Write an enzyme that holds these catalytic residues in place. Structure first.
Site, PDB file in Angstrom:
ATOM      1  N   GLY C  46       0.773  -1.225   0.000  1.00 28.20           N
ATOM      2  CA  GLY C  46       0.000   0.000   0.000  1.00 28.20           C
ATOM      3  C   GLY C  46       0.811   1.285   0.000  1.00 28.20           C
ATOM      4  O   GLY C  46       2.033   1.349  -0.030  1.00 28.20           O
ATOM      5  N   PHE C  48       2.418   4.718   1.581  1.00 29.37           N
ATOM      6  CA  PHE C  48       3.102   4.591   2.870  1.00 29.37           C
ATOM      7  C   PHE C  48       4.176   3.498   2.861  1.00 29.37           C
ATOM      8  O   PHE C  48       5.335   3.795   3.148  1.00 29.37           O
ATOM      9  CB  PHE C  48       2.215   4.443   4.105  1.00 29.37           C
ATOM     10  N   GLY C  49       3.835   2.246   2.505  1.00 34.26           N
ATOM     11  CA  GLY C  49       4.786   1.126   2.451  1.00 34.26           C
ATOM     12  C   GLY C  49       4.150  -0.261   2.307  1.00 34.26           C
ATOM     13  O   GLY C  49       3.057  -0.357   1.752  1.00 34.26           O
ATOM     14  N   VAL C 117      -2.268 -11.022  13.835  1.00 34.78           N
ATOM     15  CA  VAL C 117      -3.624 -11.465  14.093  1.00 34.78           C
ATOM     16  C   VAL C 117      -4.017 -12.167  12.861  1.00 34.78           C
ATOM     17  O   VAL C 117      -4.464 -11.489  11.989  1.00 34.78           O
ATOM     18  CB  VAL C 117      -4.582 -10.312  14.499  1.00 34.78           C
ATOM     19  N   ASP C 160     -12.952   6.118  13.618  1.00 33.91           N
ATOM     20  CA  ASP C 160     -13.155   5.340  12.435  1.00 33.91           C
ATOM     21  C   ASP C 160     -13.476   3.892  12.724  1.00 33.91           C
ATOM     22  O   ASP C 160     -12.724   3.042  12.399  1.00 33.91           O
ATOM     23  CB  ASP C 160     -11.834   5.569  11.688  1.00 33.91           C
ATOM     24  N   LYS C 162     -15.447   0.497  11.948  1.00 32.66           N
ATOM     25  CA  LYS C 162     -16.118  -0.017  10.780  1.00 32.66           C
ATOM     26  C   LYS C 162     -15.634  -1.432  10.711  1.00 32.66           C
ATOM     27  O   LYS C 162     -14.561  -1.572  11.275  1.00 32.66           O
ATOM     28  CB  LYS C 162     -15.801   0.810   9.551  1.00 32.66           C
ATOM     29  N   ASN C 165     -11.737  -2.498  10.437  1.00 27.52           N
ATOM     30  CA  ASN C 165     -10.592  -2.253  11.297  1.00 27.52           C
ATOM     31  C   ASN C 165     -10.730  -3.116  12.524  1.00 27.52           C
ATOM     32  O   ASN C 165     -10.225  -2.782  13.581  1.00 27.52           O
ATOM     33  CB  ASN C 165     -10.590  -0.826  11.881  1.00 27.52           C
ATOM     34  N   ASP C 178      -5.627   0.179  13.739  1.00 35.32           N
ATOM     35  CA  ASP C 178      -5.444   1.404  13.018  1.00 35.32           C
ATOM     36  C   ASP C 178      -6.089   2.609  13.659  1.00 35.32           C
ATOM     37  O   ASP C 178      -7.289   2.698  13.733  1.00 35.32           O
ATOM     38  CB  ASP C 178      -6.132   0.890  11.809  1.00 35.32           C
ATOM     39  N   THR C 195     -15.038   7.130   7.474  1.00 33.89           N
ATOM     40  CA  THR C 195     -15.676   6.526   6.310  1.00 33.89           C
ATOM     41  C   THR C 195     -17.105   7.024   6.119  1.00 33.89           C
ATOM     42  O   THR C 195     -17.918   7.250   7.018  1.00 33.89           O
ATOM     43  CB  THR C 195     -15.562   5.010   6.505  1.00 33.89           C
TER      44      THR C 195
END
Ligand SMILES: CCCCCCCCCCCCCC(=O)O
Ligand SMILES: CCCCCCCCCCCCCC(=O)O
Lengths: 333, 18, 333, 18
Positions: C46, C48-49, C117, C160, C162, C165, C178, C195
């Site tokens: 993604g 970022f990295g 995880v 956030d 949802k 996450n 996150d 979102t």
């Protein structure tokens, strides 16, 4: 045999073109009328209008009725698109195109009544089942091949092939739906359209394009049907375009060799070199090794057993409002 | 390019036209 | 009993707040170092990295390593967000927050090593399984409730929530991941984020908001967990907003009565009236009928058997490039 | 609002932030 097949198609395509030109030019206007269908239930909806499951009072047949609200169409500027689909659709006639059985309009709305295809779209089966096997995929490819072959001889270019517009029928066959992008074009066209992931490198590069766009689309299809996901994708079309533009695909290892080769001849950035574009056109596709086992007339005849065959709160009903209304605009309908 | 990356994108649902 | 529970939480939350303030203020800097982990395989990637599955050479434990490329972060202007997540994350400590085990940086990159995880995110199980049953959903809600209760007492507002996450662990429990939106805010904040489908009517209406935003998010969750899809959605955020703004939900019929009532107290447009916001806060949620059967301490203790427990070509490897580089900017890391 | 309409939207995959 072979020659004899060729013989046939030739003849066919020719007679076909004669019927198409006739309709193309001398259309079809107000076929049925509302009152003659009973309203069974909302199948889905959307801008433009809602799509209903109806049954033809006498005949007892079921149709899918698309109701376009004139005003909405006009506002979203979709007049030209709506009239051209009606046009194409009532002119064409092929085992794998969904059928425009009746059309009509009224104070308020435009009505397009097609043949009801219960199985739904391939898209959903695809994402659920996951991947289609080289053979399952081949059955579907075979059908598209033919369609494109036909469509093209009528100078029509479908411009939006993608699993989402291919519905599966009662016998497992495909039915191409939604022609709001098709164009009759003896030549090159320039408009920018279709779905991101299926777009041909030429469309985005703004050079004018032609029939070859649908053979590059074919390549994405067999690819997404066999892989599970498309050869180029990214969240953000821009990104996608970029990749399509480099024309650098990664075939999964389980691919065949033979399927890679066909793919590589479809996922061609160079029109000059793209299968489907060369002197032989279709022939280059139908003679590929990947299709060696295919009986094309057999497929044209639905004679082959298909591999798959498709088989929550409901909607909140409403009321054909019907209440001239946009009458200048839709005169040709 | 790859399954893991595609089922992470937003593009797994019905795609629209432009 | 009850009182005795209350007793406990009180005490707990208090001690908790003491530890949090300590870390909050006197941080944690360069924990481990690259060389001390062996590189097992790319789990995902993604902007970022890329995010790697690693195993800690001595300890033999597996971690998930997030590698942020300093330059990329800076270009996409995500400095502040990156430093605040690191901060929050190393300060917090709760049964249901994924753990920031080690952090470090080097010429090139920023490294965040969390607890691995394997089960993945709820999102995917959700769309595949379809709907979660009132009871399966309740187990997950119970966990979020608690987390929010904790998070909030540290003046933090997760912004956030949802299904995407919330990852499912080896024992079937949830782990919130996150935190790049979390904020420590004793008051009202104004930034617009999260979102679309989970956004609180207030955020979009640009009035400044507060902890209550996460209790309206809770309501969307239980709703999407129990329904299959969210209470407000549309293809095109604008559209969505509109609907969230009217605050007119349609509960499916299979809902419970009891679940509708809780939902209606969470999907409240009026902060004044929203459950979670009133004098009692959490208490209004934990005492709801819908949760009558819930042992909260039991859940805090992972003592309840969970209902579900999770159990293609691979990636194209690459190479931690590590080659100071953005050094002023990430000094606080 | 309804299952049929949601699995027709583009929003069935992972949604992003703003
Ligand atoms: C392009 C479509 C090919 C269809 C060929 C029809 C051959 C007729 C068999 C009798
Ligand atoms: C807000 C989280 C509630 C956690 C309560 C801990 C009670 C401890 C039982 C020994």
């Amino acid at each position: 045999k072979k020659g004899s097949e060729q013989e046939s198609v030739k003849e066919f395509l020719a007679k076909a073109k004669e019927d198409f030109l006739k309709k193309w030019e001398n259309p079809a206007q107000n076929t049925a009328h509302l009152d003659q269908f009973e309203r069974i239930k909302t199948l889905g909806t959307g801008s433009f209008g809602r799509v209903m499951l109806v049954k033809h009072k006498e005949t007892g047949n079921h149709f899918a009725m698309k109701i376009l609200d004139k005003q909405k169409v006009v506002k979203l500027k979709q007049i030209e698109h709506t009239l051209n689909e009606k046009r194409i659709l009532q002119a064409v006639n092929f085992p794998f195109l969904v059928k425009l059985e009746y059309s009509f309009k009224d104070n308020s709305n435009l009505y397009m009544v097609m043949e009801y295809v219960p199985g739904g779209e391939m898209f959903s089966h695809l994402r659920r089942i996951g991947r289609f096997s080289e053979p399952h995929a081949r059955f579907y490819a075979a059908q598209i091949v033919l369609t494109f072959e036909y469509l093209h001889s009528l100078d029509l270019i479908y411009r939006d092939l993608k699993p989402e517009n291919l519905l599966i029928d009662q016998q497992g066959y495909i039915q191409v739906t939604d022609f709001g992008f098709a164009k009759r074009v003896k030549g090159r066209t320039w408009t920018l359209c279709g779905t991101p992931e299926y777009l041909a490198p030429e469309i985005i590069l703004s050079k004018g394009y032609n029939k070859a766009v649908d053979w590059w689309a074919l390549g994405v299809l067999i690819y997404e049907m066999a892989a599970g996901y498309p050869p180029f994708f990214a969240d953000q079309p821009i990104q996608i375009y970029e990749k399509i533009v480099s024309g650098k695909v990664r075939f999964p290892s389980h691919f065949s060799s033979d399927l890679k080769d066909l793919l590589r001849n479809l996922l061609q950035v160079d029109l000059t070199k793209r299968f489907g574009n060369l002197k032989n056109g279709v022939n280059d596709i139908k003679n590929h090794k990947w299709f060696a086992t295919t009986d094309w007339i057999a497929i044209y005849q639905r004679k082959v057993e298909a591999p798959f065959i498709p088989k929550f709160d409901d909607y909140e009903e409403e009321e054909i409002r019907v209440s001239e209304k946009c009458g200048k605009e839709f005169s040709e309908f | 390019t790859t399954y893991a990356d595609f089922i992470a994108s937003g593009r797994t649902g019905r795609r629209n036209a432009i």
